């Protein structure tokens, strides 16, 4: 019955400002404290800021002081998180949670419900074609080879081999988001050590966001 709904997230660019809002229902919102807890994808939970039942004070984690401001509107049953000078470090999901005990003058006790949250992702966004380099097999059992799909944006790329004619041994990996803001993915197909040479090997990467299609043939040495 207690429901929290985060919103306002999305894709922003650094330096800009962004406003998250958490809509509350199922308790006298004017009586409970509220919290923001963010989580960088693939990382642990990290407390951002929190606010007592009335908005009197404003508790900040040190990593977000001066740039973040947490507020609430008791007349609207809404928790707000203001982000100023967005940075790549602020890219994370932002959960909003409701202090279990009432009238807490400070955010000490456990957080009982948690909203599903909103996702804030910042980058120097612009669509880019991916550069395709051949990952040649080791000249020196089982042999492996593949393709390197570097520095595209945004997601996703799709990799196939011989226009999809090879599936056995095929494995595409998740893309890293390098510090530049551009994604980078590789995709290799392990094969039999011997017999690589006879077959024609062409990986066909397709990056629809940039309307790029690249066919790169891989060969040893």
């Amino acid at each position: 019955q207690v429901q929290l709904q985060e919103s306002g997230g999305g894709v922003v660019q650094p330096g800009g400002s962004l406003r998250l809002s958490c809509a509350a229902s199922g308790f006298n919102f004017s009586n409970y404290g509220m919290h923001w807890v963010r989580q960088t994808p693939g990382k642990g939970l990290e407390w951002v800021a929190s606010i007592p039942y009335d908005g009197s004070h404003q508790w900040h984690a040190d990593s977000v002081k001066g740039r973040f401001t947490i507020s609430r509107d008791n007349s609207k049953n809404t928790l707000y998180l203001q982000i100023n000078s967005l940075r790549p470090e602020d890219t994370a999901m932002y959960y909003c949670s409701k202090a279990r005990i009432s009238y807490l003058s400070a955010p000490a006790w456990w957080f009982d419900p948690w909203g599903q949250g909103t996702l804030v992702t910042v980058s120097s966004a612009s669509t880019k074609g991916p550069s395709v380099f051949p990952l040649a097999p080791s000249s020196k059992g089982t042999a492996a080879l593949g393709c390197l799909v570097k520095d595209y944006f945004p997601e996703p790329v799709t990799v196939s081999w011989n226009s999809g004619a090879l599936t056995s041994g095929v494995h595409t990996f998740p893309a890293v988001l390098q510090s530049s803001g551009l994604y980078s993915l590789s995709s290799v197909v392990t094969v039999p050590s011997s017999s690589l040479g006879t077959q024609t090997y062409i990986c066909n990467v397709n990056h629809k966001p940039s309307n790029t299609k690249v066919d790169k043939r891989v060969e040893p040495k």
Partner: protein, 205 residues
């Protein structure tokens, strides 16, 4: 301020799993625990050291004494695969302190060490004035690995990127780790090595 959880815990189904949250005088703090399954929000499972909510089954019990709080899961079910975070309030810090998180894995497979496949920088990329070492890690279980890069018996800090583990087709996990270099740095040292550590044992190429 410093509360430390193990990175992952593997336990046989139906056994008793045990996740700790060690910290200086954490026995005098009020510990809470949250369980987060992939794609959803955290769920309160134990609050104030040992108390269970209404919906949480009595299999889960809490503990907190001296310098280590302990979450105990008796009669482990398969649906308990999730990340687990502990929660304290550092009175003298004005900071709520979450733990590093513990990925509890309830194994259906046996445990497999990772397969490491390392690629040197391609000739095409070298003529693009860049060099990127591609380390591919696949077919391990549980999905918890740590990657270190060694350039001539020396650690490598920046320029390293590593993916988050993900399920393969056969539900083993896989991930990739890249080392961005200048074409000079690839030639400066005599050998490069990718070190992947998984369940105490380390595999390298």
């Amino acid at each position: 301020s410093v509360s430390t959880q193990p990175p992952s815990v593997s336990v046989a189904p139906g056994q008793t799993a045990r996740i700790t949250c060690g910290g200086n005088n954490i026995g005098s703090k009020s510990v809470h625990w949250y369980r987060q399954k992939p794609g959803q929000a955290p769920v309160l499972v134990v609050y104030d050291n040992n108390a269970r909510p209404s919906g949480i089954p009595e299999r889960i019990s809490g503990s907190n004494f001296a310098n280590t709080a302990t979450l105990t899961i008796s009669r482990v079910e398969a649906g308990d695969e999730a990340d687990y975070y502990c929660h304290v309030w550092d009175s003298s810090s004005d900071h709520v302190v979450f733990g590093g998180g513990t990925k509890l894995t309830v194994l259906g497979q046996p445990k497999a060490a990772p397969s490491v496949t390392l690629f040197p920088p391609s000739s095409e990329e070298l003529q693009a004035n860049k060099a990127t070492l591609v380390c591919l890690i696949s077919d391990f279980y549980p999905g918890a690995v740590t990657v270190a890069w060694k350039a001539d018996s020396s650690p490598v800090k920046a320029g390293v990127e590593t993916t988050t583990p993900s399920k393969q087709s056969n539900n083993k996990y896989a991930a990739s780790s890249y080392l961005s270099l200048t074409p000079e740095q690839w030639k400066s040292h005599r050998s490069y090595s990718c070190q992947v550590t998984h369940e105490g044992s380390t595999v390298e190429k």
